[PDB]
Amino acid sequence: ASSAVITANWISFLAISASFIILLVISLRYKGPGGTESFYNGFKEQNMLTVFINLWCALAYFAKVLQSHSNDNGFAPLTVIPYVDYCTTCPLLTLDLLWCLDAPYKISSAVLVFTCLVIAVACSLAVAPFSYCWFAMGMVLFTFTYVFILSIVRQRLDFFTLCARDSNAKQSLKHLKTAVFIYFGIWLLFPLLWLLSYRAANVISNDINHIFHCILDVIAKSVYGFALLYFKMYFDKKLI
């Protein structure tokens, strides 16, 4: 691979590894809002989802780093077949988002995201013009999923803001809004990147697409999980 590609892969792998190790340490040391439960997150494993996500992401990038230094394909599921790592991660991200917000249809939303990602995987491994049909079907399903998840997220954000008066509550709400903006705005770029890649309109080269994918992953995973975590710890739920 090119110097830029290997450098971006190494930077992304190191960033996600550091983020995973910090999130795991914080989760293990977290003692709950009361500061008395030794294993608060042990009996609430959903709070660990973020951590696992990062770990999986890190592993994926590790494989990429190996593929960056060898002429032969590395771990095919995480390097060869596109969007499989996303198939594994993004549904967990949606589940975590709708769990911290106590939103309805969290499992339904996660399954919809998984189905959209599997449709995308089929589209990326298809041959034109059938690839266009797969992309159109995925686009309709993702439009429906995006509208549904936004409607739930907006209604939970309004509910949370209605009963958030403490300064710490306001700070946690700002972090939650930052995480929501990262989740919604950034996710819209992935379809734009696919439609702008060598597939369909070939304008952006492979290297720039890969670097943009790495940056979007790093942001929308590391910063997203950190914000979610700031919000979960520093937002009193009993204010409902």
User: Quick one: 28 or 136, whose CB is closer to ligand RET?
Assistant: 136
Q: Tokens for 198?
A: 């060598």
Cβ-based nearer residue to ligand RET, 39 or 130: 130
Q: Which of residues 95-134 bind ligand RET (CB under 6 A)?
A: 116, 120, 123
The C-alpha atoms of residue 162 and residue 105 are separated, in whole angstroms, by 22
Using Cβ positions, the residue closest to ligand RET within the complex turns out to be: 120
Member of 20, 56, 86, 99 binding ligand RET (CB under 6 A): 86
* Total residues interacting with ligand RET, rule: CB under 6 A: 18
Window contacting ligand RET (CB under 6 A); options: 25-33, 40-48, 82-90, 159-167: 82-90
Q: Are 180 and 153 in contact, with CB atoms under 8 Å apart?
A: yes
The structure tokens listed for 54 are: 């990062």
**For ligand RET, the closer CB: 25 or 200:** 200
| Contact (Cβ atoms closer than 8 angstroms) between residue 57 and residue 16 | yes
From 192, 228, 237, 232, select the one nearest 212 (Cα to Cα). 192
d(CA 186, CA 52): 21
Could you say whether residue 221 binds ligand RET (CB under 6 A)? Answer: yes
DSSP 28-81: HH--TTTT--TTTTTS-GGGGHHHHHHHHHHHHHHHHHHHHH-SS--SHHHHTS
Residue 142 found at the interface with ligand RET (CB under 6 A): yes
Among positions 68, 103, 138, 172, the unique one binding ligand RET when judged by CB under 6 A: 138
Q: Which of 12, 50, 88, 89 binds ligand RET (CB under 6 A)?
A: 89
Whichever of 200 and 239 has its CB closer to ligand RET, that residue is 200
Sole binder of ligand RET in the list 90, 100, 110, 112 (CB under 6 A): 90
Tokens at residue 161, please? Answer: 């803001």
Token pair listed for 110: 């996660």
Binding flag, residue 226, ligand RET (CB under 6 A) = no
- What's the half-sphere exposure (Cβ side, CA atoms, 13 Å) at 92? 22
Q: Which is nearer to ligand RET, 139 or 157 (CB)?
A: 139
* Spatial contact of 126 and 134, defined as CB atoms under 8 Å apart: yes
Contacts to ligand RET by CB under 6 A = 83, 86, 89-90, 93, 116, 120, 123, 138-139, 142, 187, 190-191, 194, 217, 220-221
